[PDB]
Structures are given as C-alpha cells and as structure tokens.
C-alpha cells in the first residue's frame with residue numbers, strides 16, 4: 001500500500017508497482033534515494049560525502065535527475081555501447097533529458113513476498129557503456145526482483161569528466177565514480193536491512209563498462225565486507241577501454257578547451273571547479 | 279597455345295604475354311634416344327598502374 005521505511009537519514013516513502021504479468025507479484029519502488037551528498041562546489045572532483053538527514057517523510061516515487069552527459073549523437077562510441085542502446089537513442093534520450101550535477105541517487109525494488117524465510121538477497125546493478133553516459137534508471141529491476149524474490153538496486157554515479165577526471169597527481173586522484181559506487185554500497189549495507197535485505201548477501205552485477213566496474217571493485221580493498229558476490233556480463237578490468245592510462249593528458253586538453261590550462265595542476269583543478277558543469 | 283612447328287628456328291613476331299612459357303626443341307634420327315633441350319621465354323612488361331583509395335574511438 002503506502003511503503004514507508006525509516007532509514008538512518010530519515011523516513012522515506014515508496015510506491016507500489018504492478019507488473020504486466022499475472023504470475024509475478026507486485027513490487028515496491030523507492031526512486032531517487034540519496035546515498036551521498038551532492039558533489040557540487042568544493043565537492044567536485046572530490047570523494048563522496050554521506051547524505052544529509054531529513055526530519056519529515058521524503059518521497060521516493062520518481063527518478064532523480066541523471067548525471068551530466070551528452071548522448072544526442074555528441075560523438076559517442078558505438079563500438080562500446082550495447083546495440084539496444086545505440087539503436088534506440090530517441091527513447092534512451094528521454095531517460096537522461098533531466099540532468100544535474102546533484103545526481104548521486106539510487107533506486108530500490110522490493111518483492112512483495114517464498115519457500116525459505118528470512119532476509120532476502122540484494123542485487124546491485126552497475127550500469128555503464130563508456131563511462132561517459134547512462135543511468136541505472138534505464139534498468140527496471142521490478143521483474144527480476146519479483147520473479148527471483150530478491151532485492152534489486154540500480155545506482156547512478158558521476159560520469160565522464162565529473163566522475164573520472166585525473167591530473168595524475170594529488171590535485172585530482174580520479175575514480176570519483178567508483179567512489180560513489182563504493183559509497184552506494186556502503187549506504188546499502190547500512191540501510192538495506194530496514195527494507196528486508198541481507199547485507200551479508202550482496203551481489204554486484206553489471207554489463208559492458210558496468211561489468212568493468214564490477215571487476216575493478218573486486219580489486220579494491222574498499223569493497224571488503226561490502227558485498228560477497230559479483231556477476232560480470234560482457235565486461236572486464238583487462239580490456240583496452242576499461243581504464244584510462246593517460247588521464248593527465250586528457251585533463252589538460254579539457255583545461256585548454258575551457259581556458260584552465262595553467263602550469264600548476266592544483267590551480268588547474270580549482271579553475272575547473274569554477275566552471276559550469278555543462 | 280598448341281604450337282608444334284617443324285623447323286630448326288622458332289619465330290614469334292610481336293610476342294605477347296600468353297605466348298610466353300617453356301619451349302623444348304626435340305631432335306631425333308632413329309639412332310638412340312631423341313635429343314631434347316629446354317628454354318624458358320620470359321616476356322616482360324609493365325602495364326599502367328591502378329590507383330584506388332578508401333576512407334575510414336572516433
């Protein structure tokens with residue numbers, strides 16, 4: 001009916017969803033749930049910070065804005081993205097038309113029901129085409145959750161420049177997008193129990209660059225105890241496009257393009273932090 | 279080409295690519311084994327070159 005759950009950060013209201021299938025039971029959706037603080041201002045090109053609490057009932061009945069991106073045939077790479085994505089950009093475009101730098105939100109799909117009893121497993125989907133675009137909002141976990149009797153989570157992390165820019169030194173260490181994912185997993189571990197999830201059985205899965213993300217997370221000590229299993233579909237950490245080996249090179253090209261190319265890498269990053277994300 | 283000429287001299291005027299190949303002169307008289315000698319005629323040439331071009335992440 002009216003799905004309300006109290007988390008460590010406040011009360012959240014969900015929304016019931018019926019599936020177009022008579023055997024599948026309905027599900028509860030929590031859309032636009034903040035799992036970290038907005039990466040704006042001095043928090044741009046910086047690790048994620050925990051989200052701020054709220055005292056009232058926060059609504060989670062609609063997707064939050066997606067992270068900044070330009071997929072309107074803005075010279076995207078077709079060889080890396082899934083064919084279903086590139087062959088249907090008009091529909092895909094509708095999912096990312098509403099953008100904001102404040103985009104660190106996740107979505108939760110909870111089944112309304114089987115056999116063995118106890119806390120249900122949590123499956124966290126990590127999307128990714130080329131690290132520059134996309135959103136977890138494109139993947140409805142309703143059926144997977146309802147059919148398998150598991151909790152499904154989709155995550156939105158900082159993309160492209162905002163999520164991975166690195167100067168090759170301490171000015172900008174990069175991997176902000178990965179840190180958001182780690183932070184999202186942290187939030188899940190700490191709050192999914194309130195939704196009936198098992199933090200001891202968290203599985204991360206993703207396809208394409210999303211699959212690359214999954215493997216990279218398994219090589220980081222930051223993932224210890226966070227999750228227990230991983231599923232990597234058509235994506236690894238060993239492919240040519242999984243990692244950026246010349247971040248500094250591209251960081252300066254961007255800076256030159258926006259008038260921020262100074263000798264000092266620290267001043268360069270501060271200059272970028274003053275620029276509009278667009 | 280099917281080219282059997284009874285002549286101690288082989289003559290091909292205005293030779294062509296195809297007229298090239300290996301020729302053998304056979305000589306017999308009844309006494310013993312016929313005499314054979316081989317030679318490779320290697321007609322040479324250089325036609326006009328053809329130049330084509332093709333266009334072609336991101």
Ligand SMILES: *[C@@H]1O[C@H](CO)[C@@H](O)[C@H](O)[C@H]1NC(C)=O
Pocket residue numbers: 284285286287288289
């Ligand atoms: C042999 O051929 C040459 C030219 O090919 C000709 O002048 C000559 O008369 C011929 N003689 C005989 C015996 O075949």
